[PDB]
Amino acid sequence: NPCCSHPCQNRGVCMSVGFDQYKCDCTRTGFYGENCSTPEFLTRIKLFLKPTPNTVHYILTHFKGFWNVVNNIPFLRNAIMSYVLTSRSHLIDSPPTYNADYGYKSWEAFSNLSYYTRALPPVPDDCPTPLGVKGKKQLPDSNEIVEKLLLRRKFIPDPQGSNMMFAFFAQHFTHQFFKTDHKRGPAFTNGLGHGVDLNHIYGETLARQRKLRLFKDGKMKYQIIDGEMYPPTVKDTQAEMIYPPQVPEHLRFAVGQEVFGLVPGLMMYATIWLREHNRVCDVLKQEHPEWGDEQLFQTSRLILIGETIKIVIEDYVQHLSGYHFKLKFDPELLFNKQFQYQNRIAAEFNTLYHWHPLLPDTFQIHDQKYNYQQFIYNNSILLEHGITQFVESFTRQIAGRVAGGRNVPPAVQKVSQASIDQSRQMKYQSFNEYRKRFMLKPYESFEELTGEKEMSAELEALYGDIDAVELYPALLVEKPRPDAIFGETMVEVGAPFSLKGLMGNVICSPAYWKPSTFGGEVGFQIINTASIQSLICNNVKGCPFTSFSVP
Amino acid sequence: NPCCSHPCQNRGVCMSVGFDQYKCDCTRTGFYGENCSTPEFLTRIKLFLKPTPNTVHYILTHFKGFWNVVNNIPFLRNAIMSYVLTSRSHLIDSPPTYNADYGYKSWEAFSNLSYYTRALPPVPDDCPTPLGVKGKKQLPDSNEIVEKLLLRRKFIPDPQGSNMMFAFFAQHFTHQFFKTDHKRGPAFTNGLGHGVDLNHIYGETLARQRKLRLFKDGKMKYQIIDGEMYPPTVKDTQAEMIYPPQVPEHLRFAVGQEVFGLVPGLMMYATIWLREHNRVCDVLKQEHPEWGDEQLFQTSRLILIGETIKIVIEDYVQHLSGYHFKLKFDPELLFNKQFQYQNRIAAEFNTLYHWHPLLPDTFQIHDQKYNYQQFIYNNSILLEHGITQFVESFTRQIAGRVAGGRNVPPAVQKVSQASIDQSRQMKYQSFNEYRKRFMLKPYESFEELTGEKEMSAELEALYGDIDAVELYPALLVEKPRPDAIFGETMVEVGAPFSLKGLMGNVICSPAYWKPSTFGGEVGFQIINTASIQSLICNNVKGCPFTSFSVP
Ligand code: COH
Ligand code: COH
Ligand SMILES: *[C@@H]1O[C@H](CO)[C@@H](O[C@@H]2O[C@H](CO)[C@@H](O[C@H]3O[C@H](CO)[C@@H](O)[C@H](O)[C@@H]3O)[C@H](O)[C@H]2NC(C)=O)[C@H](O)[C@H]1NC(C)=O
Ligand SMILES: *[C@@H]1O[C@H](CO)[C@@H](O[C@@H]2O[C@H](CO)[C@@H](O[C@H]3O[C@H](CO)[C@@H](O)[C@H](O)[C@@H]3O)[C@H](O)[C@H]2NC(C)=O)[C@H](O)[C@H]1NC(C)=O
Ligand SMILES: CCCCCCCCO[C@@H]1O[C@H](CO)[C@@H](O)[C@H](O)[C@H]1O
Ligand SMILES: O=C(O)c1ccccc1Nc1cccc(C(F)(F)F)c1
Ligand SMILES: O=C(O)c1ccccc1Nc1cccc(C(F)(F)F)c1
Ligand SMILES: *[C@@H]1O[C@H](CO)[C@@H](O)[C@H](O)[C@H]1NC(C)=O
Ligand SMILES: *[C@@H]1O[C@H](CO)[C@@H](O)[C@H](O)[C@H]1NC(C)=O
Ligand SMILES: [N+]
Ligand SMILES: [N+]
Ligand SMILES: [N+]
Ligand SMILES: [N+]
Ligand SMILES: [N+]
Ligand SMILES: [N+]
Ligand SMILES: [N+]
Ligand SMILES: [N+]
Ligand SMILES: [N+]
């Protein structure tokens, strides 16, 4: 297959014509030629005026006093934020295109919501190498990659100061749209909403939602333990959860996402958001004593979806970017712009979000330590310390650096290896192919990638060719930005997927983004004043200080 | 419920505030005030300058010499067509909002694809009258309405000259997205693609697609009967169909849509489109001898989707409109515009498309006459005459006038009664409400509605209040445009639903609309040169002349 070499550049569509020839479709690429390499006149101007992402990152992470003024000039802040959204979103195809089984556009790939979609098509089946033509006939042994390049020696904390509040928020929030159906294989998802629908609170199906709801005052079922609200039990809801048999029946908490029993950190956030739901129910009953249970529940869900997107943009991504520029959640920014209010979760977005180097060596709650053997599937820890102590503790505990390499804990070693194996099953193109897909310069050497001698040598010994390095491994060994948590590629690939899932939500569309959608101005204001601190303050006893960075 | 009277004007959203008050949300309506009835300044200017629909319709249906010139000035014709697409599409909320069970915006209404969506929300179930506050406490007997106002006495031919090729194309085409799940109720659909996916050829599910395919050269199963290609049978495919016990096995043809055995006119188009898929397979194999069966099938389906949109816009809606301006299917018209490439089928779109008055009292094939008892579920008629004969006969046979009243054949009398009854189950608002929803002045009298005295008196005796007249009856008795098949409301309410389903298709999006999507220029050109005449010429023996109107 002539397209195995990935000849077409700049988003050109490679199509085989005959057995030994190929064609490139350069339509609206801004280029022409056999391989869509020759820039058009306009493209040539743009390409010359366009700054490198590293430049843009320098500018955004510097000149603090300037940004603090820009942030307070609504016309400027809005104009900038609006550009961030439109420009990054242009990198995602929407409606979506390829999936694991289709390197060409097809109706099966478009319409079948059980697939993750794909930003780059799969390497065709009959190719010289796994990645196409580059690399050896067989990719290196995955466990060797982990040990040599990813496995943690000594803990490397995050220079940006990310804490466990941040790490578990990342895990909790993304696991509503990262829900791969492993009975089927890594190419499939159970999250058919394909974004921020809060199914990890309310359940994926109406059947599960009905088991978790109280059907009084719009509320969700709960227990009162030690004078505080917790999730209901599997016994009381009949909502299936994943628990090893060791777990006693009373500690089997039931929440929207089957798997959130895995760690108390997840169940901490499930509890916090559950409280928030029932709190907003109380607020809306005041505003609407005439409302029934159903409308109270639905309107609370829509408000909580708003809070989530609000908090994710203005607190979580804000922290994660390190920008002095204050990011904004404002759907009105896009009303005069071209933008598709839909989304489809990309498998590559799932792959890049395996931030297990975030995880510490031990989990430190109050004046105690817990190893993974003790921490996993142990909600006894959650009831013992309470949410307040959990927030106090997780706020102060530093997370690990994700880029730079050699920082995956041994406990989740096999998870990192699984990430590589599964991407091979799905036939991911190479790391450098994905760089080009998101308009980055491909690395010319293992050293340029790592900015370093050891790993770059280990890498060359494993792969040989720089164009043979796989997507997942390279992301974790890539040279981090100065004192940053991520390298260049993580940010430039990840941000477009993220923003599209966030602003592509139906509530951001003009038909929805009205106060009447959320019960009036009071409900609407809950969205637009939401923060990670306020989430904790309204729902955690004592209103402890919190933040996604260590004090 | 203070919203029962539908207080809020001009798209304002009504919301209860306490037990005895409401608030109108006027956001982006272009109005303000308690009921959103006060125009803003720009609104005042737009209203003053905007010509009425009947004025626009007059202009488009006169001055042929002028339009012949306009038609041949591409810059101009493109601008007009582009304007037609965007202005009509604005009348549809996309992503969708209400459904039968939600008069307020909710995640259930947005996310559950099993529902028909709703242009106007349902009337609350605790209102003083079934339509809100206007009209009597009980609605007229639906059988009375049908008999007094809708039932046919003498056939009334369509003045626009629509033939049976048109009537069965209408039925064939729309029943791919009008597929209500009566197991659940009228509010639910089995067409989860919500638009033009050609499931009525290939099947809704992958399981059904697999039964119908040949898995050789990307083709669909078929039979050769008297020299020509026909669809396969239930027995050979195992794809279930609806047939009465009378029909012998070997005549139980199996096609995408389960109900297309109901009438030979549908089975004709199913045959023609089946031939077209396999014809396109032959074309593509020649272009791509290296392609396997899968890519040949998928690429063929994408091409035929395009052919469908092409034909519907430039032949079907063209004829339908009565315009001298020449409509154009060109996804490029929208690439610089704001437009959502998605669609959700409106229940009201389904209701208004109940065009059973199109139907004759008898069906004339060649020199034979068939009444309903012998025409229904009779596929031997199809084998008897063959497709060429069917086309020639149907191209000649005139269809009935849809608007103007009293033109529903007695045979499908109960279907027309089911349409009224189901509207009431789903709590449709009134005709006048839907007129305001689509920016039409509400009718002040029944006489104004029908343009006559007789029918308007039955109407008044049945309903009492002009604001109590229901959507579906009013659509069919409404005064038709001069020598037209429809009145003002059918056109102005239906056109936006239609255009959104057509241009909102994924293939019309910029990522898909390019030659490589369709296997190159040869395939891309089958779409862009497709017409109802070429469809027939390529797949019907003898290449008989055809058209959507009688010679
Ligand atoms: C910030 C990101 C983050 C965090 C903090 C986190 C925290 C933790 C954690 C304890 C706190 C444990 C014990 C694990 C362990 C696992 N993780 Co993560 N995970 C994270 C991101 C992910 C993502 C993303 C996936 C893929 C889930 C999917 O695709 O469904 C994942 C998958 C897994 C799997 C599935 C294995 C497989 O074969 O795919 C295991 C096991 N893990 N992880
Ligand atoms: C638009 C043109 C058109 C035509 C020409 C047409 C021609 C014919 C025809 C013979 C030629 C027959 C025997 C029927 C008979 C029926 N039609 Co139509 N139908 C048409 C548009 C529709 C639509 C739209 C529906 C609703 C489909 C659905 O799934 O609800 C429909 C529904 C029906 C139903 C189901 C009614 C119910 O239970 O709700 C029957 C029976 N019929 N129709
Ligand atoms: C889209 O909306 C549909 C209508 O609400 C919904 O279908 C409904 O689903 C429920 C349960 O899923 C069915 O009722 C069930 O009720 C008892 C609970 O006590 C169960 O034990 C029963 O087994 C029964 O299944 C409703 O009958 C059903 N209604 C209809 C009209 O089909 C769909 O589930 C919604 N779709 C999604 C994806 O959520
Ligand atoms: C979305 O794509 C999925 C993957 O192709 C698809 O799932 C597949 O569905 C087929 C048929 O529905 C299954 O094949 C069946 O084949 C025989 C019956 O002849 C049985 O023995 C099998 O057990 C099975 O029922 C595939 O196994 C299945 N593949 C996977 C990975 O689940 C979905 O159906 C597609 N979604 C839609 C809405 O069409
Ligand atoms: C739980 C996260 C929700 C975000 C809301 C943050 C504010 C929480 O506090 C709220 O502040 C409002 C003013 O904005 C007041 O009107 C409310 O009375 C008060 O409850
Ligand atoms: O938001 C995520 O989930 C994200 C994930 C991975 C990588 C980058 C991510 N967001 C991000 C990172 C830097 C800058 C911006 C932007 F400012 F564009 F929003 C967004
Ligand atoms: O296209 C349909 O199926 C249609 C249905 C009902 C009513 C009008 C319809 N179309 C339509 C009727 C008149 C003019 C135009 C338009 F010109 F806008 F395209 C479209
Ligand atoms: C779970 O946590 C409790 C403390 O809350 C501890 O006593 C117990 O040993 C833990 N379980 C395991 C398996 O370590
Ligand atoms: C079906 O059509 C054929 C004509 O080919 C006719 O002989 C037969 O009587 C018809 N069936 C019925 C039930 O009328
Ligand atoms: N592409
Ligand atoms: N150029
Ligand atoms: N469940
Ligand atoms: N451990
Ligand atoms: N550093
Ligand atoms: N609305
Ligand atoms: N089937
Ligand atoms: N009949
Ligand atoms: N007329």
PDB file of N, CA and C in Angstrom, chain B residues 115-166:
ATOM      1  N   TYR B 115     -36.170   9.784  20.822  1.00  0.00           N
ATOM      2  CA  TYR B 115     -37.253  10.754  20.679  1.00  0.00           C
ATOM      3  C   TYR B 115     -37.200  11.527  19.367  1.00  0.00           C
ATOM      4  N   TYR B 116     -38.367  11.842  18.819  1.00  0.00           N
ATOM      5  CA  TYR B 116     -38.471  12.981  17.919  1.00  0.00           C
ATOM      6  C   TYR B 116     -38.274  14.241  18.752  1.00  0.00           C
ATOM      7  N   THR B 117     -37.496  15.193  18.254  1.00  0.00           N
ATOM      8  CA  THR B 117     -37.373  16.468  18.944  1.00  0.00           C
ATOM      9  C   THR B 117     -38.592  17.321  18.608  1.00  0.00           C
ATOM     10  N   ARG B 118     -38.657  18.517  19.185  1.00  0.00           N
ATOM     11  CA  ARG B 118     -39.847  19.354  19.081  1.00  0.00           C
ATOM     12  C   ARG B 118     -39.528  20.830  18.889  1.00  0.00           C
ATOM     13  N   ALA B 119     -40.139  21.416  17.864  1.00  0.00           N
ATOM     14  CA  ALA B 119     -39.948  22.822  17.543  1.00  0.00           C
ATOM     15  C   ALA B 119     -40.614  23.698  18.593  1.00  0.00           C
ATOM     16  N   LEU B 120     -41.835  23.332  18.974  1.00  0.00           N
ATOM     17  CA  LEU B 120     -42.501  23.935  20.122  1.00  0.00           C
ATOM     18  C   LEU B 120     -42.643  22.897  21.227  1.00  0.00           C
ATOM     19  N   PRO B 121     -42.445  23.310  22.487  1.00  0.00           N
ATOM     20  CA  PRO B 121     -42.591  22.374  23.604  1.00  0.00           C
ATOM     21  C   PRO B 121     -44.032  21.906  23.768  1.00  0.00           C
ATOM     22  N   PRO B 122     -44.234  20.733  24.382  1.00  0.00           N
ATOM     23  CA  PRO B 122     -45.598  20.247  24.606  1.00  0.00           C
ATOM     24  C   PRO B 122     -46.387  21.157  25.534  1.00  0.00           C
ATOM     25  N   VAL B 123     -47.705  21.169  25.377  1.00  0.00           N
ATOM     26  CA  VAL B 123     -48.570  21.877  26.301  1.00  0.00           C
ATOM     27  C   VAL B 123     -48.490  21.165  27.651  1.00  0.00           C
ATOM     28  N   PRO B 124     -48.324  21.921  28.751  1.00  0.00           N
ATOM     29  CA  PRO B 124     -48.329  21.274  30.071  1.00  0.00           C
ATOM     30  C   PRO B 124     -49.623  20.495  30.310  1.00  0.00           C
ATOM     31  N   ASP B 125     -49.545  19.383  31.027  1.00  0.00           N
ATOM     32  CA  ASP B 125     -50.682  18.452  31.077  1.00  0.00           C
ATOM     33  C   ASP B 125     -51.761  18.910  32.060  1.00  0.00           C
ATOM     34  N   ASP B 126     -51.499  19.992  32.788  1.00  0.00           N
ATOM     35  CA  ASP B 126     -52.468  20.532  33.743  1.00  0.00           C
ATOM     36  C   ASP B 126     -52.922  21.933  33.344  1.00  0.00           C
ATOM     37  N   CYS B 127     -53.389  22.072  32.106  1.00  0.00           N
ATOM     38  CA  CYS B 127     -53.866  23.353  31.601  1.00  0.00           C
ATOM     39  C   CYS B 127     -55.390  23.351  31.489  1.00  0.00           C
ATOM     40  N   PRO B 128     -56.012  24.540  31.527  1.00  0.00           N
ATOM     41  CA  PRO B 128     -57.478  24.603  31.465  1.00  0.00           C
ATOM     42  C   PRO B 128     -58.071  24.052  30.168  1.00  0.00           C
ATOM     43  N   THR B 129     -57.318  24.052  29.072  1.00  0.00           N
ATOM     44  CA  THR B 129     -57.762  23.400  27.839  1.00  0.00           C
ATOM     45  C   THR B 129     -56.597  22.605  27.254  1.00  0.00           C
ATOM     46  N   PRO B 130     -56.891  21.606  26.404  1.00  0.00           N
ATOM     47  CA  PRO B 130     -55.825  20.737  25.885  1.00  0.00           C
ATOM     48  C   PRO B 130     -54.774  21.456  25.036  1.00  0.00           C
ATOM     49  N   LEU B 131     -55.055  22.678  24.596  1.00  0.00           N
ATOM     50  CA  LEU B 131     -54.087  23.460  23.828  1.00  0.00           C
ATOM     51  C   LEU B 131     -53.512  24.606  24.654  1.00  0.00           C
ATOM     52  N   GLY B 132     -53.884  24.661  25.927  1.00  0.00           N
ATOM     53  CA  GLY B 132     -53.403  25.690  26.828  1.00  0.00           C
ATOM     54  C   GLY B 132     -54.551  26.391  27.521  1.00  0.00           C
ATOM     55  N   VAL B 133     -55.066  27.447  26.906  1.00  0.00           N
ATOM     56  CA  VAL B 133     -56.187  28.186  27.481  1.00  0.00           C
ATOM     57  C   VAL B 133     -57.281  28.489  26.459  1.00  0.00           C
ATOM     58  N   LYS B 134     -56.940  28.483  25.174  1.00  0.00           N
ATOM     59  CA  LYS B 134     -57.927  28.729  24.127  1.00  0.00           C
ATOM     60  C   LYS B 134     -58.712  27.466  23.791  1.00  0.00           C
ATOM     61  N   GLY B 135     -59.897  27.652  23.218  1.00  0.00           N
ATOM     62  CA  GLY B 135     -60.712  26.543  22.758  1.00  0.00           C
ATOM     63  C   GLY B 135     -61.577  25.920  23.838  1.00  0.00           C
ATOM     64  N   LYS B 136     -62.310  24.878  23.459  1.00  0.00           N
ATOM     65  CA  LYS B 136     -63.188  24.161  24.377  1.00  0.00           C
ATOM     66  C   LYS B 136     -62.393  23.239  25.292  1.00  0.00           C
ATOM     67  N   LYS B 137     -63.074  22.655  26.273  1.00  0.00           N
ATOM     68  CA  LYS B 137     -62.428  21.790  27.250  1.00  0.00           C
ATOM     69  C   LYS B 137     -62.024  20.462  26.621  1.00  0.00           C
ATOM     70  N   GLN B 138     -62.739  20.062  25.593  1.00  0.00           N
ATOM     71  CA  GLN B 138     -62.481  18.840  24.879  1.00  0.00           C
ATOM     72  C   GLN B 138     -62.262  19.228  23.446  1.00  0.00           C
ATOM     73  N   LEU B 139     -61.408  18.501  22.747  1.00  0.00           N
ATOM     74  CA  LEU B 139     -61.178  18.757  21.335  1.00  0.00           C
ATOM     75  C   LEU B 139     -62.207  18.002  20.505  1.00  0.00           C
ATOM     76  N   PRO B 140     -62.484  18.494  19.288  1.00  0.00           N
ATOM     77  CA  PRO B 140     -63.466  17.859  18.401  1.00  0.00           C
ATOM     78  C   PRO B 140     -63.179  16.382  18.172  1.00  0.00           C
ATOM     79  N   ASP B 141     -64.218  15.614  17.877  1.00  0.00           N
ATOM     80  CA  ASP B 141     -64.039  14.226  17.490  1.00  0.00           C
ATOM     81  C   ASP B 141     -63.145  14.178  16.254  1.00  0.00           C
ATOM     82  N   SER B 142     -62.072  13.399  16.312  1.00  0.00           N
ATOM     83  CA  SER B 142     -61.115  13.375  15.212  1.00  0.00           C
ATOM     84  C   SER B 142     -61.736  12.787  13.950  1.00  0.00           C
ATOM     85  N   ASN B 143     -62.664  11.848  14.113  1.00  0.00           N
ATOM     86  CA  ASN B 143     -63.348  11.255  12.969  1.00  0.00           C
ATOM     87  C   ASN B 143     -64.229  12.283  12.263  1.00  0.00           C
ATOM     88  N   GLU B 144     -64.873  13.144  13.044  1.00  0.00           N
ATOM     89  CA  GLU B 144     -65.673  14.233  12.492  1.00  0.00           C
ATOM     90  C   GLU B 144     -64.835  15.158  11.620  1.00  0.00           C
ATOM     91  N   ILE B 145     -63.689  15.578  12.144  1.00  0.00           N
ATOM     92  CA  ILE B 145     -62.788  16.460  11.414  1.00  0.00           C
ATOM     93  C   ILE B 145     -62.403  15.825  10.084  1.00  0.00           C
ATOM     94  N   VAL B 146     -61.978  14.567  10.137  1.00  0.00           N
ATOM     95  CA  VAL B 146     -61.577  13.841   8.940  1.00  0.00           C
ATOM     96  C   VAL B 146     -62.711  13.806   7.917  1.00  0.00           C
ATOM     97  N   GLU B 147     -63.906  13.435   8.363  1.00  0.00           N
ATOM     98  CA  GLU B 147     -65.055  13.312   7.468  1.00  0.00           C
ATOM     99  C   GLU B 147     -65.552  14.653   6.933  1.00  0.00           C
ATOM    100  N   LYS B 148     -65.631  15.653   7.805  1.00  0.00           N
ATOM    101  CA  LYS B 148     -66.187  16.952   7.436  1.00  0.00           C
ATOM    102  C   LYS B 148     -65.223  17.817   6.628  1.00  0.00           C
ATOM    103  N   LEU B 149     -63.923  17.668   6.870  1.00  0.00           N
ATOM    104  CA  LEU B 149     -62.944  18.625   6.354  1.00  0.00           C
ATOM    105  C   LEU B 149     -61.829  18.023   5.502  1.00  0.00           C
ATOM    106  N   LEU B 150     -61.546  16.734   5.666  1.00  0.00           N
ATOM    107  CA  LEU B 150     -60.362  16.128   5.044  1.00  0.00           C
ATOM    108  C   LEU B 150     -60.669  15.021   4.032  1.00  0.00           C
ATOM    109  N   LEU B 151     -61.793  14.339   4.204  1.00  0.00           N
ATOM    110  CA  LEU B 151     -62.129  13.190   3.369  1.00  0.00           C
ATOM    111  C   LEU B 151     -62.402  13.594   1.917  1.00  0.00           C
ATOM    112  N   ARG B 152     -61.944  12.770   0.976  1.00  0.00           N
ATOM    113  CA  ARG B 152     -62.071  13.074  -0.447  1.00  0.00           C
ATOM    114  C   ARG B 152     -63.431  12.668  -1.003  1.00  0.00           C
ATOM    115  N   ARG B 153     -64.000  13.540  -1.828  1.00  0.00           N
ATOM    116  CA  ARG B 153     -65.267  13.279  -2.501  1.00  0.00           C
ATOM    117  C   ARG B 153     -65.010  13.061  -3.986  1.00  0.00           C
ATOM    118  N   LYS B 154     -64.447  14.072  -4.640  1.00  0.00           N
ATOM    119  CA  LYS B 154     -63.861  13.891  -5.962  1.00  0.00           C
ATOM    120  C   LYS B 154     -62.379  14.214  -5.897  1.00  0.00           C
ATOM    121  N   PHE B 155     -61.597  13.464  -6.663  1.00  0.00           N
ATOM    122  CA  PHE B 155     -60.165  13.684  -6.753  1.00  0.00           C
ATOM    123  C   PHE B 155     -59.881  15.119  -7.158  1.00  0.00           C
ATOM    124  N   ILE B 156     -58.943  15.757  -6.465  1.00  0.00           N
ATOM    125  CA  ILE B 156     -58.505  17.094  -6.834  1.00  0.00           C
ATOM    126  C   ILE B 156     -57.037  17.030  -7.257  1.00  0.00           C
ATOM    127  N   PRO B 157     -56.761  17.205  -8.558  1.00  0.00           N
ATOM    128  CA  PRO B 157     -55.382  17.057  -9.031  1.00  0.00           C
ATOM    129  C   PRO B 157     -54.478  18.189  -8.558  1.00  0.00           C
ATOM    130  N   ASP B 158     -53.191  17.897  -8.404  1.00  0.00           N
ATOM    131  CA  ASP B 158     -52.218  18.917  -8.049  1.00  0.00           C
ATOM    132  C   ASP B 158     -52.017  19.881  -9.223  1.00  0.00           C
ATOM    133  N   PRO B 159     -52.321  21.174  -9.023  1.00  0.00           N
ATOM    134  CA  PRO B 159     -52.128  22.161 -10.092  1.00  0.00           C
ATOM    135  C   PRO B 159     -50.673  22.324 -10.532  1.00  0.00           C
ATOM    136  N   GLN B 160     -49.726  21.930  -9.686  1.00  0.00           N
ATOM    137  CA  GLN B 160     -48.309  22.002 -10.037  1.00  0.00           C
ATOM    138  C   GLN B 160     -47.892  20.796 -10.873  1.00  0.00           C
ATOM    139  N   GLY B 161     -48.792  19.829 -11.003  1.00  0.00           N
ATOM    140  CA  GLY B 161     -48.591  18.720 -11.911  1.00  0.00           C
ATOM    141  C   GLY B 161     -47.766  17.573 -11.361  1.00  0.00           C
ATOM    142  N   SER B 162     -47.623  17.492 -10.040  1.00  0.00           N
ATOM    143  CA  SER B 162     -46.873  16.399  -9.423  1.00  0.00           C
ATOM    144  C   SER B 162     -47.432  15.051  -9.860  1.00  0.00           C
ATOM    145  N   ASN B 163     -46.541  14.109 -10.149  1.00  0.00           N
ATOM    146  CA  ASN B 163     -46.954  12.782 -10.589  1.00  0.00           C
ATOM    147  C   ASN B 163     -46.714  11.733  -9.501  1.00  0.00           C
ATOM    148  N   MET B 164     -46.904  10.460  -9.832  1.00  0.00           N
ATOM    149  CA  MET B 164     -46.748   9.396  -8.850  1.00  0.00           C
ATOM    150  C   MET B 164     -45.283   9.083  -8.592  1.00  0.00           C
ATOM    151  N   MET B 165     -44.422   9.398  -9.553  1.00  0.00           N
ATOM    152  CA  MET B 165     -42.987   9.304  -9.328  1.00  0.00           C
ATOM    153  C   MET B 165     -42.598  10.231  -8.181  1.00  0.00           C
ATOM    154  N   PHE B 166     -43.256  11.385  -8.117  1.00  0.00           N
ATOM    155  CA  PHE B 166     -43.025  12.352  -7.053  1.00  0.00           C
ATOM    156  C   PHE B 166     -43.588  11.851  -5.728  1.00  0.00           C
TER     157      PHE B 166
END
